[PDB]
Amino acid sequence: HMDKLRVLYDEFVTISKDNLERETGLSASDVDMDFDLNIFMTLVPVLAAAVCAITPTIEDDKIVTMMKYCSYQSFSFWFLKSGAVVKSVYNKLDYVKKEKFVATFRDMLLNVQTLISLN
């Protein structure tokens, strides 16, 4: 179950860890997708309210703004380690990887969002 989400999450984590460890010199903590799923479930409604609805056609610039508000300190693999946000990793990617990272992050949010449809 959640097989597509696993693929997206693993990519997000790999890219994030690689850049966070390189920039800070710190070592990532263990990955816990179960834990991080719950984090994303909380993030989705706040980001939708603070920025705009998360949809497959959301403007890329809006996703990048959402990245500014997502702190790695909240996730399993960087818990309370530093103040870095997802946009800080975006900023260090090359111009091609940047676009793919936007798609990966968006699609991760979209997938998590399908888990939390209203009654």
Binding region for Ni ion (CB under 5 A)? 1
Q: How far is the CB of 37 from Ni ion (least distance, A)?
A: 11
Q: How far apart are CA 107 and CA 58, in angstroms?
A: 11
Residue whose Cβ sits closest to Ni ion: 1
Whichever of 21 and 32 has its CB closer to Ni ion, that residue is: 32
In the complex, minimum distance from the CB of residue 89 to Ni ion, in angstroms, rounded to a whole number: 26
- Residue 8 or 102 having the CB closest to Ni ion: 8
Rounded to a whole number of angstroms, the minimum distance from the CB of residue 100 to Ni ion is: 24
Q: Which lies closer to Ni ion via its Cβ, residue 31 or residue 93?
A: 31
Helices (H), the chain: 3-24, 33-50, 60-68, 86-90, 95-113
CA distances from residue 39 to 36, 58, 103, 109, 119 in whole angstroms, order as listed: 5, 21, 19, 11, 21
